[PDB]
Amino acid sequence: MRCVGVGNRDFVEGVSGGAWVDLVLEHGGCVTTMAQGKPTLDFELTKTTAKEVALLRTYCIEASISNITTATRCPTQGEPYLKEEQDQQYICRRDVVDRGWGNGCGLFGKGGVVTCAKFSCSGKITGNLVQIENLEYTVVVTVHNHGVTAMITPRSPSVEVKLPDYGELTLDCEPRSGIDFNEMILMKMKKKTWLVHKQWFLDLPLPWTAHWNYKERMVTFKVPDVTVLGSQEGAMHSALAGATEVDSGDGNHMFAGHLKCKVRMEKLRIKGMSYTMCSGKFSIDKEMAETQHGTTVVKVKYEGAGAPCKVPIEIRDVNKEKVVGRIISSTPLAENTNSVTNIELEPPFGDSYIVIGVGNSALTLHWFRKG
Amino acid sequence: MRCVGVGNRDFVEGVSGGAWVDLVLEHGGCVTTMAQGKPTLDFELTKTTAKEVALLRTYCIEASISNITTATRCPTQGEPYLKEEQDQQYICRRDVVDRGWGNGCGLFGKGGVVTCAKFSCSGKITGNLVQIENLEYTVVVTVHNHGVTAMITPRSPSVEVKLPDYGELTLDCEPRSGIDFNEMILMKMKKKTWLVHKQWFLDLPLPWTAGADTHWNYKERMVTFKVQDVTVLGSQEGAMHSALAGATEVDSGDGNHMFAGHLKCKVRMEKLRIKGMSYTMCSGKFSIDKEMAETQHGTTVVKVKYEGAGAPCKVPIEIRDVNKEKVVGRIISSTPLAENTNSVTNIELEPPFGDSYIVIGVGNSALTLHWFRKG
Amino acid sequence: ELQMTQSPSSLSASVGDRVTITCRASQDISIRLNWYQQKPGKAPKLLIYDASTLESGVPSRFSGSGSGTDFTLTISSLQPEDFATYYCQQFNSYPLTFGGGTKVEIKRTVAAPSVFIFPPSDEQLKSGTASVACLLNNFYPREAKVQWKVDNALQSGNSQESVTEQDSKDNTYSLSSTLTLSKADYEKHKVYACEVTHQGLSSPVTKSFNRGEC
Amino acid sequence: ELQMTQSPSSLSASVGDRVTITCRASQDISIRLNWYQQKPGKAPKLLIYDASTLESGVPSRFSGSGSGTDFTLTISSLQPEDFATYYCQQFNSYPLTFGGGTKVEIKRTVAAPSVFIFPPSDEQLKSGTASVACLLNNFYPREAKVQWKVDNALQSGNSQESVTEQDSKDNTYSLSSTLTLSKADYEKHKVYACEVTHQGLSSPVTKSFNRGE
Amino acid sequence: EVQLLESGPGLVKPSETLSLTCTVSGGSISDFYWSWLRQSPGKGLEWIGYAHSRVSAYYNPSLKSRVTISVDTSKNQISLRLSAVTAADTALYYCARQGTGTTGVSEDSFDLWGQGTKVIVSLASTKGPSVFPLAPSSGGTAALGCLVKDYFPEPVTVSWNSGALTSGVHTFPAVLQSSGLYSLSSVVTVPSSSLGTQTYICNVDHKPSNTKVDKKVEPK
Amino acid sequence: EVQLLESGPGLVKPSETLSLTCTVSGGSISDFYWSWLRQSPGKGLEWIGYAHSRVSAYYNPSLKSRVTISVDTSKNQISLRLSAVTAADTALYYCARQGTGTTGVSEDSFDLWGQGTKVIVSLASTKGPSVFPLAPSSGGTAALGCLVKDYFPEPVTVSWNSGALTSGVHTFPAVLQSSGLYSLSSVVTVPSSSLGTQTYICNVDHKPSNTKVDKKVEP
Ligand SMILES: *[C@@H]1O[C@H](CO)[C@@H](O)[C@H](O)[C@H]1NC(C)=O
Ligand SMILES: *[C@@H]1O[C@H](CO)[C@@H](O)[C@H](O)[C@H]1NC(C)=O
C-alpha cells in the first residue's frame, strides 16, 4: 500500500507462469508488481549511499591574517631575512622600495623589503573520490494489506529478501548510472554534499592540502599591507546552481541513475491462500476514492465470525451479471472480527458495480470512470 | 625636496626666457621643474576623486530568511492563499505535491501548496554613475629648501597657486584619461570603491533596487525553494573579490583616492620669484651636516651648516674640474639660502661624469669635497 | 493467534516398537512443518522438513506425515539412539512457533522406590536452618507422590522436589524431596515422616525418625 | 624675523602743508610695499601699491617713494579728508607684517583746558564705592598731566584716564580721569583735589572740593 | 565446518539490558539469515527473531518492543540486545541459521545450531555452597549423600571420593529456593559392610565463587 | 559691488574656540584669495592668514598652531577657527581680498575689506549699566555729566535730552576696570543761566543687557 498516492508510479505485470518480474527503480518513483499466484508488492528505492570514499584534496574557503612582521633594509646592504620565511604556516613575499634620506637611509636607491603573515583557515571544503563499486542501494518491499528493507551493492547484486507470512523472494539487481564516476568528485560543504566534475574541483583557485599549498590564492600583498579574499561560501553556491546535491543535511542522499532489477518470485506465496470465503456482513470504513492512475482504493470492515477469511470482491457490469474488472491487491484477508482491510481495485471505463460480500447481505457500490 | 628619493622622477627644463613649463603628472610619478630666474619646484599628483556621482542601482550580497509560512490544500479544493503573497517584502512560490490518505486528504491527486518567506538584506552594494566632468585632481607643489595643495576640475582647469616667500604661479591643466566613463560604473563595497564596466554591473544575478531607501526586485536570485524548504545563497562578499581581481580600486578605505590617467599641465612661472635673490654671499665657514649621497638619477644631495654671522645669506657652491679651475657642473636647487646662524640647508647638485670638486664657501676657509660619477 | 499443540507430553516405549508423535495446529499451515530431535544438554537437530521430506543422514525409520492441521512423526523401529525429546514447528505464518514437546522414554518393568529419610546435620542446625532430605532411589514409572509430616500434620509449603533423568544402566528414576524448616520450628516438633505413594508399592510406605534419637 | 618700523608715531599739521611719512624695513624688500589709510571706526583703504603705484580714485597729492629698506609716503597739499591713521605693509617675505601706524592730526592754536571736578553721588555711596571724575574740556595739544590728591597726598593707583578723539568743530581734545575709592576710604578723608598740568596754563590749576559741603 | 559460538555474560540483574554475541566461524556471515532462539522449562522453544547483513531484522511480537538483533560483518558476529529484562527472560539462548531454499536445507528451518548460553535473571549475590553431610541410618545396601545448600548462580560440580566412586551416584538437578539461592543433593548407594571400613568424601566445586568444599560423610 | 559681511558672536570665554564667518556677496568666491586680519591697540594690524577654494590655506606662525581658515563654496562664506583663545586675542577681526595680479589690484594687497567684527575675551557676565549723575558745582558756562559705571560687554549709546542736546556733548571712550566691567562718562558744557530753568536727562542704552536707563542731572 506504499505506492498508493505516489505520482510517479509504474505498474509491472509478470510472465504468464509468473516466477520473475523485470523492473526499473529510481528516486521518487514507486513500482507496483503483479503476478499470478503471487502477492502484490510495492518496490521503492529509498536511498543510495557511497560507503567507502577516499579523500583526494581539501581546499580553504574562509581565512584570516595574524602576526604581521615587516623587515626593512637600506641600499647597498644585504637582503632582509625573517625566521617566519622557513616556517610553512607563514606567507612571505619579497620586493624593493625607494629608500633614501626621508626613509631613514644613508644612501639613495631601491631597498629590499620582506613581509610575513600567519595563515589561519576557519572554513574548509572537503572533496572525496567516487567509485561505482562502493554504492549501497536501499530498496523497500511493501505488501498490499512500513515494509522490509534490502541492500544492493555491485559486489553483492543478488539478495534473498524474506517477507514474513508471504514467504520470500530473490532480488537480483544491476546498477546503471548515466554519469562517469572517474570524471566526478563528491564535494562536501558544512552539512551538504554535491556531485561535481573532477577537473573543476582540481582547478579551483584556493589554498589546498594533500601546511596549505598555494597560500597566495587568498592573501594579497600591497606594496606601500595584507588583504584576505574573505569567505568563498557564497562564491561556491553560485557555481553549485547546476550541480546536483547528494546529502542535503537532513540525511536524505540520492544519486541520479536507474537500478534495473529482476525479482525472482519462485518461493513467494499469498498469505491466507487456504482461507475460506467470508460469510458475514461488510461495511465501508472509508469511502472509495480514485487515484492518479485510475485505480480505486476502499476500506471495508468485517462483521461476521468466519475470520480469518477471504473478502469476496467482484467488479461487475451495469446490469451486475458478468465480472468486467480486476483487483490489484492479491487475495485480501479479514484478520479478525471488526478488522479493516485496504483494497486497490481497477474498474473499467464507464458504469461499474462493486460487490463486496455474499448473497443479499452483500454491499453494492456504484462507480463511474472517465475516459 | 619632495621628488628627492622617488624612483619614477622626471626632470623638465623651461624655455630660454622662462615664463612657462609643459609637464605631465601621474600617480606615483614626481616632476622637478627648472627655469632661469625662477625657483626649483616639485610637482606630484597626490589624489583624484569623483565629487558628484549619481546613484544607478543597489544590489544585495548578504541576505537572511525570516517568518516562513506554509499553506496546504487537498485535491479538488481551491488553491491556497496567504496575506504575505500581496506584500512586497515576502517571497512566494506556488507548486503542486502528491496528496492522498497518507498526506491527510480524502481524495488522491496533486494538491496545491504555497510557501512565503520574509526577505531581509544585511549586506548591500552600491553602484554610482561616473563621468569626466566631476573629477577633482589634487596637485602638491613643493619648493627646494609639506608644500602647497591645488585642486583641478575640468570645469575650472586653470588655478592660480600662491607660494609664500616665492611669489605665485598660474597652474593651467588638462585632464587626459584613456578610459570611457560612459561604459564605466563606480561600484562601492563596504569602505572600498572600484571602477567596473557598465554592462557587467547591470548583468549581476543579485536582488536590486532602483533607489537607495534604508522592496527588492528579483528576490529569487538568492532564495531557492525546495520540494517546503527555503535556502539562502549566503554572503557574496568573497564572490565579488574574485571578480574584482582585474579591476582597479579608486579608494582603499584608508584615504588613498586614484584614477588611471595623465594630467597634462602648463605652469605659468610669470610672477614666480626666488626667496633671497637680494641676499648677500655667505662670508662665514660651512660644515657638512650629512655626507653627500648620489640619487637614482645621478644627482647628488648634501646638507650644510652655516657658522658665520652674515645670515640670512646665499650659500656659495661651485662644481669645479679635477684641477679646481673652471665650473663644469650645475646646481638643481635654485639659489640656496642660510636662514640663521647654525642652520642646515638641503642642496641638490648635478656633477659631471668622472672626477669633480665641490667648493662650498669662500676663500681658503671654504669646504672642498671630491666626487666621482660612473658612466 | 496460531497455537501449536503436540500430543502426548511424554511417551514410554521399548526398543523396536513403532511410535506415533502427533502435532496439531489451530489453523491451516499446509505442508509447511519441521520436526526436531533434542537430547539433554545438546542443541536441537532437524530430522524432517516440509512435513514429510527427510534431512541428509537421518535414518529410513523416521517418517513425516500430515497436511493442514493434523501432523504425524513415525519411527517404524525404535532404537536406543532415538530416545530424546521431539519438537514440531510451523513456518506458514509469523511468528515461528514450536510445540510442547514429546519425551520418548525407555519402557521398563514396574519397580518400587527404595525410600530413605535423612535427618538435618548438627552443622546446619548451628546456622539456624534445618533441611530434611527424603530419597526415592531407583523406580519406574516417573509418577510418584511425596507427602511431608511435621508431627502427623500434612505439610504444604517448604517442600522442593527434584527428579533425575532416566538412568543408562537400569532405566529407573530417582526423587529427592527437601523440607526446609527453621531451628525454632525444628526443635518444636518430634516425629518427622516422609510418605511415598507409587505404582510399584502396594500401600503408601512411610519412612520416619524421632528428634534426637539412636 | 623681518620687522616693520614706521616713524613718527603721531604727526601734527595744518591744511595745505606737505607731510612726510617714513616706513623702515630691517631687510631688503625692494618695491614690494603697500600704503593704507584708516579713519576711526572704518576699515583700512589702500592708496599706494608696489611702493609707488597709485590706486584708482586716489588723488594726485598722494605719492609713493622708496626701495629696499627706507620708504616714503608724501601728501603735497594736506586736506581735511586726509586726517587719518596711515599704515605700511610688506609682501616680499611671509608672514605679511604691518607698521606701527602714523596718526595725522590737525594743527591748532594752544588752548588751556576748562577743568571741572565732580563729587561721587549718594546713589553710588549706597553701593559701597565712590568715583571722583575730573573733566578737562577742550584743549590743545593732547599732552596733559592729571594728579590726584586724597588729602594733600599724591595718589598713584585707582586712577584711569580716557581721551576723546580730535573734535570736528574746534579741533580740541578732552580728558576724564576717574579716582575709584571704597565707601570706608572716601569717608576717611576731607579735601579731594585734581591737579592739571598743561602747556596752555601758566602754572598747574587745581580744582578741589570738601566732603559734605 | 560452519560453527556458531555464543558469548555471555550469563547473569543480568532485573530492569538492566541483556547483551549476547554469536560468532560465525568457518563460513561467510553476509550470505545466511541468522536467528536467535530461547529455551526454558514451562515456555519451551521460543523464537525471538532473525537478522541479515543486507536485509532488515524481524522479531516476535512478544519481544519486538524490547529486542534488537543486528549483524556485524566486520566482527563476524550477531548481537542480541534485550531491554527491561524480567525473571521470565531466564532461559538458554541459542543462535541458529534460518534456512531460505538456496541457503541451509529449506525455508525457515534451523539446520545449524549454536552451543547455547544460560542466562539467569536475579538480584542475588554470588554465594559459596554450604555442604552438609546426609549420614546413613542404622536391605543389604545403605544410602548416604551431601546437601549442597544456598549457592548462586548455576552450575555446581559434585563427585565422590575424588572421581573414584561413580557407581550408585545420583546428582539431582538444582532447585531455586525462595531466598533466590540454589539447593542441590547428591546421594550414593553403597553396601552396609562397606560402612566404617571405607571413608566417603564428596568433592563439591563451584567455579563462580571459586570454592572447592570437601565434606566427609559418616554416621553420628 | 562685491561685499564682505562678518558674522559673530563677539564674545568668547577664555580657553574656548572662536568661530567667525565672512560672506561674499555680489561676486564668485571660488576665484579670489580670501584673508583674515585682526586689529587691536598695542598690536596694530595683524595678518592671521589666507584661504582659497582650490588652493591650500597658509597662516602666520604666531597663530598657525591654533588657527584654521577654510572656504565654503556652497555657502559662499570663509570660516575662521581660532582655538585656545586668551585675553591677547581681544581684537577687531576683518576679512579681506588678498590680491594676486590677475585678481584684486596687485600681488598680496588687500583692496576689498569687510565691515569688521569686535571680539571680546572674558569670563565676565552680562551686567546692565549703573548710571550716576555728575552734578554741576556752584566762567560763564558750567559742566554736568553721567557716570556709566560697571557694564559688560561693549558698546553703549549715550545721548542728552533724547537727542535734542548735541552741542557741548563729550562721550569719552570706555575703560576696562580691574573687575572686568567697563566704565564710561559723558559730559556736556551748558551756560550757568540755563541751570534751574532747563532740565538735563542722559539717555543711556545698552543693547546686550536690553536696558534703557534715563537719569536726570541736578545740583
Ligand atoms: C599573535 O598576536 C596575538 C595578538 O596580539 C598574540 O596573542 C599571539 O601571542 C601572537 N602569536 C605569535 C606566535 O607571535
Ligand atoms: C515574525 O516573527 C517574530 C518572532 O516570532 C514575531 O515577533 C513577528 O510578529 C513576526 N512578523 C510577521 C510580520 O509575521
From the structure above, extract its key features:
heterohexamer; A: 371 residues; mainly beta; Tick-borne Encephalitis virus Glycoprotein, domain 1; Viral Envelope Glycoprotein, domain 2; Viral Envelope Glycoprotein, domain 3; 4 domains; 6-stranded antiparallel beta sheet; 5-stranded mixed beta sheet; 2 helices; 3% helix; 49% strand; rod-shaped; E: 220 residues; Immunoglobulin-like; 2 domains; 0% helix; elongated; binds 2-acetamido-2-deoxy-beta-D-glucopyranose; Genome polyprotein (chain A)
What report would you give on this structure?
The complex is a heterohexamer, with 2 copies of chain A, 2 copies of chain C and 2 copies of chain E. Chain A is mainly beta and 371 residues long. Chain A is built from 2 helices and 26 strands. Chain A has 4 domains: 1-51 and 133-177 and 244-270, Tick-borne Encephalitis virus Glycoprotein, domain 1 (Sandwich), CATH 2.60.98; 52-62 and 122-132 and 178-212 and 229-243, 2-Layer Sandwich (Viral Envelope Glycoprotein, domain 2); 63-121 and 213-228, Viral Envelope Glycoprotein, domain 3 (2-Layer Sandwich), CATH 3.30.387; 271-370, Immunoglobulin-like (Sandwich), CATH 2.60.40. In chain A, strands 5, 6, 7, 12, 13 and 14 form a 6-stranded antiparallel β-sheet that branches. Chain A has a 5-stranded mixed β-sheet with strand order 1-3-4-8-9, with no helix packed on it. In chain A, strands 2-17-11-10 form a 4-stranded antiparallel β-sheet, with no helix packed on it. The longest helix of chain A is centred in the middle third of the chain and has 7 residues, at 233-239. The two termini of chain A are 25 Å apart. Chain C is mainly β and 214 residues long. Chain C has 2 domains: 1-108, Immunoglobulins (Immunoglobulin-like); 109-211, Immunoglobulins (Immunoglobulin-like). Chain C contains 2 helices and 18 strands. The longest helix of chain C is centred in the middle third of the chain and has 6 residues, at 122-127. The termini of chain C are far apart. With 220 residues, chain E is mostly beta strands. In chain E, the strands form 5 sheets. In chain E, strands 4, 5, 6, 9, 10 and 11 form a 6-stranded antiparallel β-sheet that branches. In chain E, strands 13, 14, 16, 17 and 18 form a 5-stranded antiparallel β-sheet that branches. Chain E is elongated. Chain E starts with a strand and ends with a strand. At the C-E interface, β5, β11, α1, β12 and β16 of C face β5, β10, β13, β14 and β16 of E. One 2-acetamido-2-deoxy-beta-D-glucopyranose binds at residues 66-67 of chain A. The PDB classes it as viral protein/immune system. The entry lists the keywords dengue antibody membrane fusion, VIRAL PROTEIN-IMMUNE SYSTEM complex. It forms a hexameric assembly. The entry is titled "Crystal structure of the envelope glycoprotein ectodomain from dengue virus serotype 4 in complex with the fab fragment of the chimpanzee monoclonal antibody 5H2". Chains A, B are envelope protein. Organism of A, B: Dengue virus 4.
